[PDB]
Design a protein around this ligand. Sequence first.
Ligand SMILES: O=C1CC[C@]2(CC(c3ccc(Cl)cc3Cl)=NO2)C(=O)N1
Ligand SMILES: [Zn+2]
Length: 100
Amino acid sequence: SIFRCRQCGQTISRRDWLLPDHEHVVFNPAGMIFRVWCFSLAQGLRLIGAPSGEFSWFKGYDWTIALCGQCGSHLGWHYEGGSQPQTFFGLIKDRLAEGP
Ligand SMILES: O=C1CC[C@]2(CC(c3ccc(Cl)cc3Cl)=NO2)C(=O)N1
Ligand SMILES: [Zn+2]
């Protein structure tokens, strides 16, 4: 029901906050594959830098790197500047732990 940072246990999100498919399998320009779950809402992150559109997986959205606010582990990206919705989070599924 709750998603925590796999590395340190920081509270991040909830199954209830998943945003549809909620799963997207993508590759960055360094050829790294991420299984990304989209969330309407997340907490306990630190958004680093200003947004960029470069190589955005989601048409009309700019991304900022989302670290775990506690341990600094890269948990995914915040997406902004789009429409329906304006903002959402793309979190790397295998860097989260699910439970009570
Ligand atoms: O939506 C996204 C999130 C982030 C991103 C873009 C990206 C990147 C951008 C510029 C440079 Cl110079 C180097 C990198 Cl390694 N890495 O992952 C991606 O591909 N799509
Ligand atoms: Zn963490």
